[PDB]
Amino acid sequence: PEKVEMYIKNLQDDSYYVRRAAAYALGKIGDERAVEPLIKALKDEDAWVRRAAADALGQIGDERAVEPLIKALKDEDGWVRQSAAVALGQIGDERAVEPLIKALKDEDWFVRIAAAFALGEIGDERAVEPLIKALKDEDGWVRQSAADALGEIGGERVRAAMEKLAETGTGFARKVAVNYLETHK
Amino acid sequence: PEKVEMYIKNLQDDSYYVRRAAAYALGKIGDERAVEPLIKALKDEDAWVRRAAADALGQIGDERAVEPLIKALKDEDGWVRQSAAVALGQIGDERAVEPLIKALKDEDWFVRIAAAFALGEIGDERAVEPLIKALKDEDGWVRQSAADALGEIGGERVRAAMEKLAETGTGFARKVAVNYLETHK
Numbered sequence: 384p385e386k387v388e389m390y391i392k393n394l395q396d397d398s399y400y401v402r403r404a405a406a407y408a409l410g411k412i413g414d415e416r417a418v419e420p421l422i423k424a425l426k427d428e429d430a431w432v433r434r435a436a437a438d439a440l441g442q443i444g445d446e447r448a449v450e451p452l453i454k455a456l457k458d459e460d461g462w463v464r465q466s467a468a469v470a471l472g473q474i475g476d477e478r479a480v481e482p483l484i485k486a487l488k489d490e491d492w493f494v495r496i497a498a499a500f501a502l503g504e505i506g507d508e509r510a511v512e513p514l515i516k517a518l519k520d521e522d523g524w525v526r527q528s529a530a531d532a533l534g535e536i537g538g539e540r541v542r543a544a545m546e547k548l549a550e551t552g553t554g555f556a557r558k559v560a561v562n563y564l565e566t567h568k
Numbered sequence: 569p570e571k572v573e574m575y576i577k578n579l580q581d582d583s584y585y586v587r588r589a590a591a592y593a594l595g596k597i598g599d600e601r602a603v604e605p606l607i608k609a610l611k612d613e614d615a616w617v618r619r620a621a622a623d624a625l626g627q628i629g630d631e632r633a634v635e636p637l638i639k640a641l642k643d644e645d646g647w648v649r650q651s652a653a654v655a656l657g658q659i660g661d662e663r664a665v666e667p668l669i670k671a672l673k674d675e676d677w678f679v680r681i682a683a684a685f686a687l688g689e690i691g692d693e694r695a696v697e698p699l700i701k702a703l704k705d706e707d708g709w710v711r712q713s714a715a716d717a718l719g720e721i722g723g724e725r726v727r728a729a730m731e732k733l734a735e736t737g738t739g740f741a742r743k744v745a746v747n748y749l750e751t752h753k
Contacts, residue, residue, distance in 0.1 A: 389751065400743040401750065407716065408751075431712070527616070531592065558585040565586065566574065566593075 387414045394420050399429040406432060410439025418443060422451045430460040437463060441470025449476045456482050461491035468494060472501025480507045487513050487529075492522040499525065503532025511540045515548070518556035530559045542567070572599045579605050584614040591617060595624025603628060607636045615645040622648060626655025634661045641667050646676035653679060657686025665692045672698050672714075677707040684710065688717025696725045700733070703741035715744045727752070 386408070393405035406424055409417035417439065424436035437455055440448035448470070455467035468486055471479035479501065486498035499517055502510035510532065517529035533541050541563075548560030571593070578590035591609055594602035602624065609621035622640055625633035633655070640652035653671055656664035664686065671683035684702055687695035695717065702714035718726050726748075733745030 386751070393751070398743060398747070400740070401747045403712075404715075404719075404747050404751070431708075523616075527588075530589075534589075555585070558583060562583070562586045562589050566571070566578070566589070 384412055384414065387412055387416055391417060391420050394424050399427075399432060402427060402429065402432045403435045406435035406439045410435070410442040413443055415443065415445060418445045418447055422448060425451050425455050430458075430463055433458060433460065433463045434466045437466035437470045441466075441473040444474055446474060446476050449474060449478055453479055453482045456486050461489075461494055464489060465491070465494045465497045468497035468501050472497070472504040475505055477505060477507055480505060480509055484510060484513045487517055492525055495520060495522065495525045496528045499528040499532045503528075503535035506536055508536060508538060508540045511536060511544060515544055515556070518548075518552075518559060526555050530555075533559070534563070569597055569599065572597055572601055576602060576605050579609050584612075584617060587612060587614065587617045588620045591620035591624045595620070595627040598628055600628065600630060603630045603632055607633060610636050610640050615643075615648055618643060618645065618648045619651045622651035622655045626651075626658040629659055631659060631661050634659060634663055638664055638667045641671050646674075646679055649674060650676070650679045650682045653682035653686050657682070657689040660690055662690060662692055665690060665694055669695060669698045672702055677710055680705060680707065680710045681713045684713040684717045688713075688720035691721055693721060693723060693725045696721060696729060700729055700741070703733075703737075703744060711740050715740075718744070719748070 390405040390408045393401050396402055402424065406421060409421060421436045421440050424432055427433050437452060440452060452467045452471050456464050458464050464486065468483060471483060483498045483501050487495055489495050499514060502514060514529045514533050518526055520526050545560040545563035548556050549564050552560055575590040575593045578586050581587055587609065591606060594606060606621045606625050609617055612618050622637060625637060637652045637656050641649050643649050649671065653668060656668060668683045668686050672680055674680050684699060687699060699714045699718050703711055705711050730745040730748035733741050734749050737745055
């Protein structure tokens with residue numbers, strides 16, 4: 384906690400590693416003063432810095448990072464987008480829901496996982512139908528995370544969809560739905 | 569919490585997804601009754617079940633899972649080993665230190681990351697020299713996680729090594745060491 388301004392100041396250092404390490408440290412410390420300088424490091428030249436900055440903003444958890452993080456979901460770098468999604472998941476703000484639904488169709492499997500995870504944490508039923516679609520994703524971990532997110536959301540929209548999948552679905556989606564029906568009253 | 573025995577019982581179900589979902593749920597619930605049945609699911613036929621079981625044991629955090637998890641660091645499946653390492657990191661027990669040092673040389677990049685992370689969390693200085701070596705890993709995320717773990721460990725063995733790297737090291741290891749010297753008194 385004593386080193387918060389030293390690390391804020393290191394977000395301007397010429398060395399990418401010093402900037403990255405500063406963002407990482409500021410996420411762990413959790414002091415709110417770091418929020419605006421981290422928002423700025425979401426446009427850093429170096430992708431590792433942008434990743435660490437998103438990560439740190441999620442850890443601090445201040446809603447002021449929501450709109451900048453939503454933008455960072457369009458970053459050229461896959462791991463930045465992944466970090467932004469996890470961070471929006473951690474903050475829990477419903478404004479991320481539609482942008483994260485889009486990121487469920489991201490070309491990188493690791494981004495789609497993070498998008499599903501985050502939708503599950505936010506808990507908003509608009510995500511239900513897009514998560515049912517992700518049950519057919521070519522990546523196994525994506526499918527799985529969409530199933531977990533469906534369970535976390537819950538409620539009557541999830542129940543009704545799981546009845547239909549248990550009835551006519553195939554493959555993984557079927558197994559998900561049947562587990563659902565066995566494990567709820 | 570009401571469903572703990574239902575999910576324990578589902579660890580014997582014929583469907584791999586029902587067993588996997590049960591392990592996942594039992595990790596979230598956190599009831600100690602789940603520990604021995606999860607230890608057993610670390611030898612499940614299906615790799616997703618073994619992964620979820622390790623993950624859940626780390627979340628519950630009971631030291632009784634330490635020796636079974638150490639064994640699971642030799643699993644044929646890369647993601648099981650990864651999960652076992654993260655879990656040993658979360659439990660924090662020093663008995664994992666030597667097995668995790670070995671897993672820093674794992675053939676999968678994701679395992680080496682998890683091994684570095686876990687050593688950093690356990691905080692034991694036997695890891696210092698092997699983590700300095702990981703600064704030369706071909707994977708960028710591995711190197712980074714080894715640098716973070718060095719910072720988390722700290723103390724005089726880390727200080728002395730970072731002085732030498734700042735003096736004669738090259739590339740990433742150099743940048744790590746110099747950041748170290750700039751950020752400590």
